[PDB]
Amino acid sequence: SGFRKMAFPSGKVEGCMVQVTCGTTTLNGLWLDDVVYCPRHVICTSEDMLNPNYEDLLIRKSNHNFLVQAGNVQLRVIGHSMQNCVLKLKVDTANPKTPKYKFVRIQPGQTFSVLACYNGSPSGVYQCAMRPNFTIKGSFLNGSCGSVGFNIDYDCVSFCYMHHMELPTGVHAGTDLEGNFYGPFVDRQTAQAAGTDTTITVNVLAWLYAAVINGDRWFLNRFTTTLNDFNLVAMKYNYEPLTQDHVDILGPLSAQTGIAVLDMCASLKELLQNGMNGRTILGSALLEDEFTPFDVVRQCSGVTF
Amino acid sequence: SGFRKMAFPSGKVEGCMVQVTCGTTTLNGLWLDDVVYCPRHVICTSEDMLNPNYEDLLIRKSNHNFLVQAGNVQLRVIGHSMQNCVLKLKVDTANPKTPKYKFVRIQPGQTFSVLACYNGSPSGVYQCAMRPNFTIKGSFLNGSCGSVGFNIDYDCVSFCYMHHMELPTGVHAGTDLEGNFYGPFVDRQTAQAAGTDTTITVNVLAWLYAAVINGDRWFLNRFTTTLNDFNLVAMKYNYEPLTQDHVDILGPLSAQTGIAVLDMCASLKELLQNGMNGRTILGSALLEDEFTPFDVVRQCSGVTF
Numbered sequence: 001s002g003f004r005k006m007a008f009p010s011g012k013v014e015g016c017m018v019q020v021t022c023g024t025t026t027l028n029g030l031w032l033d034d035v036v037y038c039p040r041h042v043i044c045t046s047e048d049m050l051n052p053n054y055e056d057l058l059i060r061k062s063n064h065n066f067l068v069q070a071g072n073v074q075l076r077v078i079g080h081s082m083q084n085c086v087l088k089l090k091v092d093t094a095n096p097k098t099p100k101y102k103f104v105r106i107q108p109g110q111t112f113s114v115l116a117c118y119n120g121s122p123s124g125v126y127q128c129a130m131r132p133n134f135t136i137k138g139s140f141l142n143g144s145c146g147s148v149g150f151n152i153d154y155d156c157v158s159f160c161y162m163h164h165m166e167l168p169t170g171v172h173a174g175t176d177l178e179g180n181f182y183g184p185f186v187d188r189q190t191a192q193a194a195g196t197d198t199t200i201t202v203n204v205l206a207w208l209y210a211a212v213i214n215g216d217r218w219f220l221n222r223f224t225t226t227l228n229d230f231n232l233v234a235m236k237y238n239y240e241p242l243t244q245d246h247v248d249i250l251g252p253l254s255a256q257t258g259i260a261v262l263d264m265c266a267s268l269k270e271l272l273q274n275g276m277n278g279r280t281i282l283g284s285a286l287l288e289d290e291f292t293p294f295d296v297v298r299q300c301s302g303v304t305f
Numbered sequence: 306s307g308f309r310k311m312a313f314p315s316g317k318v319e320g321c322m323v324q325v326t327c328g329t330t331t332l333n334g335l336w337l338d339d340v341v342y343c344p345r346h347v348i349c350t351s352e353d354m355l356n357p358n359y360e361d362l363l364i365r366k367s368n369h370n371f372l373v374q375a376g377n378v379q380l381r382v383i384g385h386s387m388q389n390c391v392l393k394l395k396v397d398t399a400n401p402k403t404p405k406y407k408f409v410r411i412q413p414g415q416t417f418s419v420l421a422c423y424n425g426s427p428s429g430v431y432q433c434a435m436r437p438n439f440t441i442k443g444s445f446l447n448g449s450c451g452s453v454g455f456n457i458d459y460d461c462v463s464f465c466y467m468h469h470m471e472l473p474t475g476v477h478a479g480t481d482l483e484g485n486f487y488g489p490f491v492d493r494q495t496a497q498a499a500g501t502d503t504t505i506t507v508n509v510l511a512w513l514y515a516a517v518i519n520g521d522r523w524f525l526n527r528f529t530t531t532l533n534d535f536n537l538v539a540m541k542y543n544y545e546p547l548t549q550d551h552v553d554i555l556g557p558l559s560a561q562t563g564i565a566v567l568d569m570c571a572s573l574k575e576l577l578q579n580g581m582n583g584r585t586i587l588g589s590a591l592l593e594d595e596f597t598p599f600d601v602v603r604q605c606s607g608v609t610f
């Protein structure tokens with residue numbers, strides 16, 4: 001029993017983290033096989049960040065300008081190329097600690113673990129969701145750039161996120177491992193609008209199911225609803241509209257608890273309309289949306305890597 | 306910016322986890338140097354758990370009854386001894402992945418990371434506090450026994466917790482690495498009272514400081530208080546009494562924010578008495594007490610391992 005925001009074990013990623021420097025500040029990179037991946041703004045001075053011409057800035061750099069260090073082991077850079085907002089630095093040594101891995105572009109509302117690093121060294125790990133508006137609410141300081149987000153399935157690390165930037169609003173923006181931003185963002189020091197965000201309905205429901213499994217049952221009521229009715233309420237409270245695809249994804253949890261999805265929706269409806277009246281659920285006084293249906297089953301059934 | 310419940314990177318501990326079996330069920334052990342540490346109830350059948358005579362049960366076991374496996378690598382057990390509620394299994398091979406490490410008995414109100422494991426394999430990592438009543442609110446299923454709690458400072462893993470038991474109330478109890486329970490608990494399947502618990506005042510204050518650093522400032526008021534006045538309120542709301550030692554520990558955060566400790570106490574007083582009026586702090590609608598003053602500085606200054 002119990003329910004926590006659990007991250008994946010970070011070891012396999014820890015063995016891939018390096019430091020990359022290219023004339024000024026140091027950031028993190030990710031060493032897989034014989035390639036180091038890092039944010040392209042490693043080549044920028046503080047002044048460059050205002051309006052970088054990355055192509056021009058990169059042209060001034062050579063292989064030998066990239067200093068890459070894995071712990072105290074210097075790596076030798078033998079090629080470099082820019083791909084969207086990332087640099088790929090070819091090194092002469094394959095990382096011996098490379099895990100089985102894939103690059104994945106995740107969907108909004110999905111979750112992942114972040115290994116926050118500074119100077120190529122791991123500081124901490126936490127679980128994040130990709131917000132509907134393609135920001136993440138992380139914990140990042142200057143120099144965390146290049147830290148990655150990931151999931152692990154069986155032996156395989158699916159990298160989905162590289163950290164680039166804190167927006168002026170204090171939320172975080174980054175790319176997939178091919179250097180494509182999530183969301184409308186660009187890598188420069190400008191004010192940039194994030195979408196209006198919404199609450200991830202399917203995740204809140206998953207977390208209500210987790211609560212029931214864990215014995216928190218006070219919010220279960222005698223009402224039901226329809227997808228249409230529920231979605232009126234979802235609209236009013238800035239929740240994502242629920243679809244049959246979401247209902248299908250919730251099937252396992254519905255089966256485990258014996259509580260029909262639309263019955264749980266009616267519980268959620270009542271919580272949205274009446275609040276929690278100073279009660280808690282799973283140690284929270286708000287409706288939590290950073291756990292997927294997969295996350296709940298993973299944790300409530302003890303799957304390992 | 307941002308503030309998350311951040312765990313330590315788990316890699317150094319992942320390399321120490323093994324599976325231990327001794328006639329029935331498998332649990333986890335911790336392999337350091339040439340010793341494997343695990344819960345002593347690895348020697349118990351389900352029936353034994355009701356009222357185990359551990360000394361008698363252990364006498365029936367020999368070195369060769371302990372099957373220890375590190376991934377797919379069998380270890381050979383060449384001695385065993387019981388120490389309080391743990392077994393120490395001497396193996397013929399020193400773990401090559403042993404980190405610099407210490408065993409520590411932590412204080413109530415301190416925090417640590419838990420590497421939840423099953424069958425000697427890591428499932429996930431999260432941050433926990435030791436409650437004032439010496440329970441932890443974890444996330445554990447059957448077979449998680451032997452999972453450990455730890456802190457990392459520079460290169461050194463301080464093991465402070467080994468998981469033993471879920472109480473009938475759904476909170477968790479365990480030992481230090483010398484096998485001494487935290488709290489009044491014993492390793493048998495009985496109803497056992499935990500103390501009345503309290504909120505960790507010094508941690509709530511630390512987290513209020515974290516909020517200010519992160520820009521959440523609405524709860525700062527024009528009042529101050531005294532330690533004596535504040536402690537009347539602390540009493541009423543089942544908070545730990547604040548001492549000058551706690552004030553001293555909060556000094557750095559007070560200096561960083563320019564907010565005197567007793568001024569922050571007066572903010573806390575007002576929150577306790579009036580609630581949050583449907584607002585949030587650092588994404589929480591309650592007063593959070595699982596971050597130490599050290600935790601806040603660690604995260605807000607980006608210290609690595």
Ligand SMILES: O=C1C[C@@H](C(=O)N(c2ccc(-c3c[nH]c(=O)[nH]c3=O)cc2)c2cccc(Cl)c2)c2ccccc21
Nearest residue numbers: 024025044045046140141142164165166187188189306
């Ligand atoms: O989460 C983060 C990351 C970081 C952040 O956001 N950006 C950032 C700020 C400064 C530099 C920098 C460049 N060159 C130097 O020689 N010295 C520097 O210091 C690089 C990136 C940044 C700013 C705008 C655009 C982009 Cl793509 C990155 C940062 C700074 C403060 C707090 C949090 C964070």
Ligand SMILES: O=C1C[C@@H](C(=O)N(c2ccc(-c3c[nH]c(=O)[nH]c3=O)cc2)c2cccc(Cl)c2)c2ccccc21
Nearest residue numbers: 001329330349350351445446447469470471492493494
């Ligand atoms: O967090 C936990 C750990 C676990 C839990 O609490 N206890 C536990 C339950 C069963 C066994 C067991 C022994 N021998 C077998 O052959 N098969 C078994 O299955 C061992 C320990 C336990 C119970 C009482 C006292 C002690 Cl010291 C340990 C457990 C079970 C269910 C849910 C959570 C947890």
Ligand code: NA
Nearest residue numbers: 039040041187
């Ligand atoms: Na960039």
Ligand code: NA
Nearest residue numbers: 128129136137
């Ligand atoms: Na997020």
Ligand code: NA
Nearest residue numbers: 344345346492
């Ligand atoms: Na035990």
Ligand code: NA
Nearest residue numbers: 433434441442
């Ligand atoms: Na706890």
